[PDB]
Design an enzyme around this catalytic site. Structure first.
Site, PDB file in Angstrom:
ATOM      1  N   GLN B  18      90.739 127.517  13.557  1.00  0.00           N
ATOM      2  CA  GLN B  18      90.432 127.583  12.134  1.00  0.00           C
ATOM      3  C   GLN B  18      90.590 126.224  11.457  1.00  0.00           C
ATOM      4  OE1 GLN B  18      89.184 129.899  10.165  1.00  0.00           O
ATOM      5  NE2 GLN B  18      89.513 128.822   8.223  1.00  0.00           N
ATOM      6  N   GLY B  19      89.514 125.751  10.837  1.00  0.00           N
ATOM      7  CA  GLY B  19      89.534 124.490  10.118  1.00  0.00           C
ATOM      8  C   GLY B  19      88.584 124.514   8.938  1.00  0.00           C
ATOM      9  N   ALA B  20      88.988 123.890   7.835  1.00  0.00           N
ATOM     10  CA  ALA B  20      88.173 123.870   6.624  1.00  0.00           C
ATOM     11  C   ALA B  20      86.982 122.922   6.753  1.00  0.00           C
ATOM     12  CB  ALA B  20      89.023 123.499   5.417  1.00  0.00           C
ATOM     13  N   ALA B  22      84.783 123.768   9.973  1.00  0.00           N
ATOM     14  CA  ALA B  22      84.097 124.509  11.026  1.00  0.00           C
ATOM     15  C   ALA B  22      85.057 125.520  11.641  1.00  0.00           C
ATOM     16  CB  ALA B  22      83.575 123.561  12.094  1.00  0.00           C
ATOM     17  N   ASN B  23      84.507 126.549  12.275  1.00  0.00           N
ATOM     18  CA  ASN B  23      85.323 127.566  12.927  1.00  0.00           C
ATOM     19  C   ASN B  23      84.995 127.706  14.407  1.00  0.00           C
ATOM     20  OD1 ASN B  23      86.875 128.293  10.661  1.00  0.00           O
ATOM     21  ND2 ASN B  23      85.268 129.673   9.919  1.00  0.00           N
ATOM     22  N   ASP B 136      93.385 111.593  15.918  1.00  0.00           N
ATOM     23  CA  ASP B 136      94.402 112.636  15.896  1.00  0.00           C
ATOM     24  C   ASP B 136      94.519 113.357  17.234  1.00  0.00           C
ATOM     25  OD1 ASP B 136      96.232 114.648  15.249  1.00  0.00           O
ATOM     26  OD2 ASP B 136      94.694 115.910  14.326  1.00  0.00           O
TER      27      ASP B 136
HETATM   28  O1  BX7 Z   1      88.967 122.413  18.392  1.00  0.00           O
HETATM   29  C1  BX7 Z   1      89.522 123.125  17.572  1.00  0.00           C
HETATM   30  N1  BX7 Z   1      90.684 123.943  17.953  1.00  0.00           N
HETATM   31  C2  BX7 Z   1      91.204 123.917  19.332  1.00  0.00           C
HETATM   32  C3  BX7 Z   1      91.437 125.358  19.770  1.00  0.00           C
HETATM   33  C4  BX7 Z   1      90.327 126.246  19.179  1.00  0.00           C
HETATM   34  N2  BX7 Z   1      89.105 126.046  19.918  1.00  0.00           N
HETATM   35  C5  BX7 Z   1      89.024 126.473  21.311  1.00  0.00           C
HETATM   36  N3  BX7 Z   1      89.770 127.505  21.740  1.00  0.00           N
HETATM   37  C6  BX7 Z   1      89.725 127.925  23.022  1.00  0.00           C
HETATM   38  N4  BX7 Z   1      90.535 129.041  23.481  1.00  0.00           N
HETATM   39  C7  BX7 Z   1      91.755 129.526  22.849  1.00  0.00           C
HETATM   40  C8  BX7 Z   1      92.428 130.607  23.416  1.00  0.00           C
HETATM   41  C9  BX7 Z   1      93.612 131.093  22.825  1.00  0.00           C
HETATM   42  C10 BX7 Z   1      94.126 130.505  21.672  1.00  0.00           C
HETATM   43  C11 BX7 Z   1      93.458 129.423  21.102  1.00  0.00           C
HETATM   44  N5  BX7 Z   1      93.956 128.773  19.891  1.00  0.00           N
HETATM   45  C12 BX7 Z   1      95.031 127.797  19.973  1.00  0.00           C
HETATM   46  O2  BX7 Z   1      95.528 127.523  21.050  1.00  0.00           O
HETATM   47  N6  BX7 Z   1      95.514 127.150  18.766  1.00  0.00           N
HETATM   48  C13 BX7 Z   1      95.027 127.372  17.437  1.00  0.00           C
HETATM   49  C14 BX7 Z   1      95.260 126.061  16.730  1.00  0.00           C
HETATM   50  C15 BX7 Z   1      96.578 125.631  17.293  1.00  0.00           C
HETATM   51  C16 BX7 Z   1      96.569 126.169  18.686  1.00  0.00           C
HETATM   52  C17 BX7 Z   1      92.275 128.937  21.694  1.00  0.00           C
HETATM   53  N7  BX7 Z   1      88.917 127.326  23.912  1.00  0.00           N
HETATM   54  C18 BX7 Z   1      88.141 126.290  23.557  1.00  0.00           C
HETATM   55  C19 BX7 Z   1      88.167 125.825  22.234  1.00  0.00           C
HETATM   56  I1  BX7 Z   1      86.956 124.201  21.644  1.00  0.00           I
HETATM   57  C20 BX7 Z   1      89.014 123.188  16.126  1.00  0.00           C
HETATM   58  C21 BX7 Z   1      89.497 124.077  15.143  1.00  0.00           C
HETATM   59  C22 BX7 Z   1      88.873 123.932  13.937  1.00  0.00           C
HETATM   60  C23 BX7 Z   1      87.907 122.967  13.890  1.00  0.00           C
HETATM   61  S1  BX7 Z   1      87.749 122.180  15.431  1.00  0.00           S
END
Ligand code: BX7
Ligand code: BX7
Lengths: 646, 646
Positions: B18-20, B22-23, B136
């Site tokens: 989640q980001g303000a 893109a999702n 970052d």
């Molecule tokens: O890139 C971003 N975010 C990086 C992660 C979100 N995207 C992806 N997620 C997964 N699988 C997955 C599985 C279980 C849980 C999670 N979530 C987390 O682990 N979190 C939430 C934020 C802090 C830690 C993700 N695979 C590939 C991706 I790409 C951005 C967020 C907002 C703008 S860009």
């Protein structure tokens, strides 16, 4: 696809505002069906207490005022829980929506601009007094609502959302210099807060006044940043706008308004200095808010008196205060027309006008723009006429591109619309000219009649005098036969010497009385042959063509939004494009060959008539002074000394 | 409620990131059903050409590498048109997800940390060499994927989205000083770009190593900014972490790792200097990227040899290079244990160990952590044992608050888990101690047997010598009767003088041979009575209690997410809360009264045994040297000079 709360409901398709932090949709209260604008926050802003909610709610509802969009509620979304803001729906759109109209391509109409100024400044006033200092004021967030009386009212929005969610949870991972950038950020709340608002507001006011940004570089500000930077940081005090022509080089420099701006000269004289002091990039000489408010309020409180300079053929709006005397009025009229007080001669509704040296403006006669105070000088001046900008049609690129074609049609519609406005104004100057001339002639005839009254009034005196000395001498030298016979003869002779001059004056008066008949040279028959008439309908012809063009433009907007077309739709698009070319070309052709030409003809003949009229006026005055001198002379011989008798 | 493209389909309920701006959602390829992560841009970023799309697509697909999430596509949404990014789905989550596990509350396990370091540094390497400089880097965007071999692989994400949509269409309305802030922004691409990444990466590495941020103020960084600022901007070179205890005051200063960090001493010795040079806030002494890469690569290339200091009762991981000799190895072992090379005595699998002065580490014996190279000195040292941190249970607040209770249960689970790890390690030190002691005893018995071999080997020589001079003299003074009788008698006498010493040595050897039997003082029967055994199952008892606690914690997480509970659910929540108190308390009680106490008992008796053993060892050596001296002496009288004869 719809979202809802316990009280409200809205569709995702019905968007109004778009921002990468929250969205605005048009929804309804499901108990009443009333339209409201809802601000659904784009998530993120949560896992945060509900007392900040209520306190910010109390401080934002305290902002219940005109010129500010009303806040109705803060509610939770039914399923997604995230907060939405129930606020007043403004159906007409914003200031940006208004300025995007081709009719306002070259600035808003004057009354509407006064409205904008009043409402925006009011909003800022109520905002600052309540602790909130706005940072970004732009046409995008200046909403518009039609009042019960019909005229618009502007409301400020997007001010409570001072949420600092940008930066680049990177707080605990940033280099100390990003924190130093945050230090460079928090140095704006010092004094760089209640004065930047003044800058943005200055830019907004210029945009609303002229229909274009004050500082323009290559093809666009965002399309060329590095030059825009120096354009802004470079400008000196007093300056208003700096425009970069060509594909590079320096700039052009102006402390005045663009020629295309139709704001009256007076309002412009009141508007230029405030903008210059409000667009400064330093401390003291940037104007504190209080003096800016006093200034704007001063401008907004003044009433407007319409006058028409009949020697320059130029209309004027004098911005006099509601308590100022006639002296300062005459000084303003002078300031715009360069004719000094004692030279100013005024006419209202076919009759003369005289202002007491201390008459207030409240008790002044009510003037519209089609019934003003006609003004004239006693000396000889040159006609100036309307000063507009000769804007030419943009080259309609032979191609096929929906975006570019939409933009093109927008530009064309704007130009043609400006031509319509200009044509209407020219017709106005012409009509006011005709009316004022008719009145002025019929007002000189009055001075003639009065002069004749005075003249005959003295001629009966001369008559009775000569006749009397004739009688008295006759009976004298009849009764006493002899006598002095040679003494009174000189009084008789000089009385006759006066009667001769009287005859001459009678003759010349006859001459001017012939020149104020019809047939003669100083009749108003050129004004019936020269110029353009209401019955010529040129304005409405231009209006028809403009209607066609406008329809095509709206169509191109719609086509642009559709991104690409079907076969037939495409061919129709092309056909209508060339049709638009023909319409615009014909309109401009008719504006030049029919509206401007005859205007300047009428204008020139009006000058050549003004000379003759002023000349004859001076002759008439001279003859009147002569008659007065004669009356002064004859008033001696009414009582004379006779010899002392035994 | 679902969105889709021509190839992919995803639910709005299935969010991942989640980001303000893109999702990220988890969706599928509808042709195969394969899981992919889709990044749907939060609108805004459009009315922009499709060639920037293809060029950025080509430069982002060039980023096809391990340690980087694969980019599969850039597609349009079916109805809403806005762009989505098809990329690799990482089911396990990110580094942040891993660190949020209570088992990793006090830092990652060592192997996993090495994995993290390797993969992150690799990702940075491949990123910089391809033009992209990350800004970052945080656990939030360090994704995790389980490889085919079972061990995890970390991939960097969120780097191509360097979109500058923040600022505060306010470009053409901003004060020149906001542009000056933008100037203060664009001065980061100079050298403040490829070195801030090093800072953020340093913070990430500390967070992963210790389980907590390097710079902590009051209750939290974001919860107290103004102090955090000075904490960061204040730290000098060499420093690693600065923690603020209490509700104010200054700080605490450390250039070393927290006691709770279980990273081996060697890796820590390799990790402290790099972090210190990477968390500096100036130019030269902040380490350029190349040397940082060379350093990290140097660390990551080394192999690990496990050794166990049996005199300090302390385990060690030596980080030797795959080509380094045994000399530098001994220098490292010394560096960790303060016993110098020539004092080091090594044991592997019940037998001695000798290293050639230039033996490579590739050919070293393979050691796990449960089968290491036991090391010991020749002198007398003191036992040190495991150095952990005595962390105490957090006060379980008697109240009712779902968020606070969830957090509380998290903390408790973390503490109890640390107690489990510590218990396991203590048991390990105990077991390795028992094994190494058994081996060392059975290894001293070898030296005893060898010594006896040497001894008897010389005793047969003494025997044959004395017997021989007896024989020769007997036959001499039998055959010749007379004679020298008084000359050889001294050789005989001194040979006997040697035989006496031999007898003494035999006696003392007998004494030590009695002390290496069972029954005697130097047997290993204290190691069977003292300490804790695998059969005691203390670790798995702690594990059961920890399981209960963990279940309750997960339950409290779930309850927190539900925001508020039903009546019965609430009462159950309370019951389980106090139950959690009892479980944690019992676990800690068993850790102290059963696991630590007996550990220190075993420890002390091990020291008191080590003294005696070393003493007896020195005695044995002395006696051996004596035997060697005797052999040296007797080797003279094997051939002696007789008188010259005629
Ligand atoms: O890139 C971003 N975010 C990086 C992660 C979100 N995207 C992806 N997620 C997964 N699988 C997955 C599985 C279980 C849980 C999670 N979530 C987390 O682990 N979190 C939430 C934020 C802090 C830690 C993700 N695979 C590939 C991706 I790409 C951005 C967020 C907002 C703008 S860009
Ligand atoms: O406040 C914002 N935006 C201000 C306007 C959006 N909100 C409102 N809209 C209306 N009615 C209305 C009717 C027709 C057209 C429009 N749209 C415009 O005129 N636009 C779009 C942006 C430029 C000019 C609005 N009434 C009340 C409000 I509140 C924000 C946008 C994003 C975050 S905050």
């Amino acid at each position: 696809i719809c979202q809802s709360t316990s009280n409200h409901l809205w569709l995702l398709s019905d968007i109004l505002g778009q921002g990468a932090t929250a969205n605005v949709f048009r929804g309804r209260h499901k108990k009443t069906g009333d339209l409201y604008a809802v601000k659904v926050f784009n998530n993120i802003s949560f896992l945060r207490p509900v007392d900040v909610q209520m306190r910010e709610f109390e401080v934002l509802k305290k902002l219940n005022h005109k010129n500010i969009v009303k806040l109705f509620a803060i509610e939770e979304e039914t399923t997604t829980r995230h907060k939405v803001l129930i606020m007043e729906f403004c159906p007409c759109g914003s200031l940006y929506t208004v300025l995007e109209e081709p009719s306002n391509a070259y600035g808003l109409p004057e009354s509407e601009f006064l409205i904008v100024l009043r409402d925006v400044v009011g909003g800022m006033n109520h905002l600052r007094e309540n602790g909130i200092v706005h940072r970004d004021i732009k046409p995008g967030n200046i909403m518009r609502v039609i009042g019960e009386d019909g005229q618009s009212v502007y409301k400020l929005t997007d001010f409570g959302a001072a949420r600092e969610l940008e930066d680049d949870g990177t707080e605990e991972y940033l280099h100390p210099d990003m924190y130093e950038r945050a230090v460079l950020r928090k140095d704006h709340q010092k004094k760089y807060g209640a004065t930047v608002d003044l800058w943005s507001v200055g830019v907004t006011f210029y945009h609303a006044a002229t229909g274009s940004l004050p500082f323009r570089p290559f093809e666009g500000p965002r399309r060329n940043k590095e030059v825009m930077y120096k354009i802004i940081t470079g400008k000196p005090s007093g300056a208003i706008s700096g425009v970069q022509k060509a594909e590079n080089g320096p700039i052009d420099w102006s402390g005045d308004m663009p020629l295309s701006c139709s704001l009256s000269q007076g309002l412009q004289a009141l508007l230029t200095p405030v903008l210059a002091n409000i667009l400064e990039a330093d401390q003291e000489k940037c104007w504190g808010f209080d003096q800016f408010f006093a200034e704007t309020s001063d401008v907004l409180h003044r009433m407007v008196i319409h006058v028409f300079s009949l020697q320059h053929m130029t209309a004027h709006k004098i911005y006099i205060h509601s308590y100022n005397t006639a002296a300062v009025f005459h000084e303003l009229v002078y300031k715009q027309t360069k004719i000094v007080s004692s030279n100013q001669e005024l006419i209202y509704e076919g009759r003369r006008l005289v202002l007491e040296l201390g008459r207030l403006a409240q008790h002044f006669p009510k003037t519209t723009e089609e019934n003003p105070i006609f003004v004239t000088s006693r000396e000889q001046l040159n006609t100036v006429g309307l000063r507009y900008e000769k804007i030419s049609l943009p080259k309609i690129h032979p191609r096929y591109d929906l975006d570019g074609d939409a933009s093109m049609a927008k530009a064309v519609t704007g130009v043609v619309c400006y031509a319509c406005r200009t044509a209407s104004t020219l017709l106005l100057y012409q009509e006011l000219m005709r009316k004022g001339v008719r009145w002025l002639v019929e007002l000189v005839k009055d001075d003639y009649n009065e002069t004749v009254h005075k003249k005959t009034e003295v001629v009966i005196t001369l008559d009775f005098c000569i006749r009397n000395i004739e009688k008295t001498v006759k009976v004298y030298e009849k009764l006493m036969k002899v006598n002095e016979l040679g003494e009174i003869s000189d009084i008789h002779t000089k009385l006759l010497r006066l009667s001769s001059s009287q005859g001459t004056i009678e003759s010349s008066l006859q001459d001017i009385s012939s020149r104020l008949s019809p047939g003669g040279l100083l009749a108003d028959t050129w004004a019936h042959q020269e110029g353009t008439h209401p019955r010529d309908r040129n304005v409405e012809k231009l209006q028809v063509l403009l209607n066609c063009i406008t329809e095509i433009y709206y169509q191109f907007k719609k086509d642009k939004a559709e991104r690409r077309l079907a076969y037939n739709e495409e061919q129709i698009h092309k056909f209508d494009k060339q049709k638009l070319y023909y319409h615009a070309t014909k309109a401009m052709s008719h504006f030049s060959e029919e509206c401007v030409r005859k205007y300047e003809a009428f204008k020139d003949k009006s000058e050549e008539w003004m000379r003759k009229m002023l000349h004859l006026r001076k002759q008439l005055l001279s003859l009147t002074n002569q008659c007065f001198d004669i009356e002064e002379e004859v008033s001696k011989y009414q009582d004379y000394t006779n010899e002392l008798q035994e």
